[PDB]
Structure 1
Amino acid sequence: SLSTEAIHAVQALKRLTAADRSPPAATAAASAALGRLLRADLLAAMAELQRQGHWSLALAALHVARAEPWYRPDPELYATFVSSSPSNDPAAAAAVDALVEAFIEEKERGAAGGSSEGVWVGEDVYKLTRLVRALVAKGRARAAWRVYEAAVRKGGCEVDEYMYRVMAKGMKRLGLDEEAAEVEADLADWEARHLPDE
């Protein structure tokens, strides 16, 4: 559930942006109501806004969160934003794609080393699969592909059959037959190394 501090923060955010729906003031209202909540409270506020349907406000909260010092690029966090995004909404869809681009840029922002390259290597497989699943579920075939290609194809994040099947089926039914075939190939390679051989 939500601490009274987070509940009051959400109410505060809504009531302020009510008198002015405009996004410029909406931002200033977010840092005003959510500016300095403990990580746990800010995350709960965000989730509550998503749950209620105030997606644009949830995004505003994300903005605030990105400024916090504890902030870290997290696939699960991004998946909730995709899941809660409005269906049949061109603007929303673009926002989702943009979000995916933001997640990969945030994650890879800290990489300049021949040092053991692992920006994606240590990533949570389940969470990353959840993000991909959500993107597919919302028809963001391209976005899904950027993520897979970034974290698995290049990032060298070791995934499993479940992840592959999700992608292959996703790309297929979404009309990227080209990429579907590549996933199947990646899967084929995987199988070629885990399947008991003789």
Structure 2
Amino acid sequence: SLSTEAIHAVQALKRLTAADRSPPAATAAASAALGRLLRADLLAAMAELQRQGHWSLALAALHVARAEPWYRPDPELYATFVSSSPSNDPAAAAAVDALVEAFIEEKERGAAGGSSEGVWVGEDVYKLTRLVRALVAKGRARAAWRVYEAAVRKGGCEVDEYMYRVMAKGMKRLGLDEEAAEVEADLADWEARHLPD
């Protein structure tokens, strides 16, 4: 739920942008209304905006969160944005992809670039699977494939049958067959290492 500190933060951001909805006035009100909010409250207000359908304003709270010190690239955080994005929206579709790009960049910008070893290894499987599954739902095939190819195939993050099953079905159901065949191959290799006899 929302603390009275958060609910009022959302209220403010809306009353402010009520008069000016342009993108420059948005991040101005977002930064002002969600400026030094405790990690917990900021994160909540962000999801509260998503819930209400104010996606653009949620992205604003996302740019504010990035400028905070506790901000970390979270697969789940992004999954939310992907899920709460307007369907049948070419503009939004792009933002979703650009978002997925930001995530991977941020992730590999941390102690990566040559990390001993791996930004992606040790990543939360469940949360990562949620982002992927979410993208495959909105139909961002290419975008879903990039997270996989980067975190599982190149990133060396060990996932499970559930993850593969999601990607395999996803890619095959969104046209990317060469991709689907690869996922089935990775799984084949997975099942080879874990199956018994």
TM range (shorter): over 0.9
Deviations 1:75-95 (A, max 9, x none): 000000000000000000000
The verdict on how the C-alpha distance between 1:28 and 1:172 changes in structure 2, with shifts beyond 3 A counting, is: same
Identical pairs, percent: 100
> Are the structure 2 counterparts of residues 112 and 65 from structure 1 closer, same or farther at C-alpha, using a change threshold of 3 Å?
closer
CA contact (8 A) 2:112 2:118 kept: no
1:22–1:183 CA distance, 2 compared to 1 (3 A): same
- TM-score of the two chains, using structure 2 as the length reference: 0.98
Aligned length: 197
Specify every segment of 5 or more residues in structure 1 that has no aligned partner in the other structure, as ranges.
none
Residue 118 (structure 1) shift: 1.8
Please state how far the C-alpha of 1:115 moved relative to its aligned partner: 5.1
- The runs of 5 or more residues in structure 2 that have no matched partner are none
Q: Report the secondary structure of 1:88's partner residue.
A: coil
The 3 A distance-change label for structure 1 pair 160 and 112 is closer
How has the CA–CA distance of structure 1 residues 2 and 112 changed in structure 2, closer, same or farther, with 3 Å as cutoff? closer
Query: Could you tell me whether the CA contact under 8 Å between 2:6 and 2:42 is conserved in 1?
Result: yes
**Two-structure CA RMSD over aligned residues (Å):** 1.0
1:113 deviates by 6.3
Change (3 A) 1:142 1:21: same
Stretches of 4+ moved more than 2 A in 1?
110-116
Q: How does 1:17-166 map to 2 (within 5 A)?
A: 17-112=17-112, 116-166=116-166
Farther-moved stretch of structure 1 (11-20 vs 113-122): 113-122
- The alpha carbon displacement at 1:110 in A equals 2.2
State the SS of the aligned residue for 2:48: helix
Could you tell me how far 1:111 is from its partner in structure 2?
Answer: 4.3
Deviation string 1:137-168 (CA, Å, 9 cap, x unpaired) is 00000000000000000100000000000000
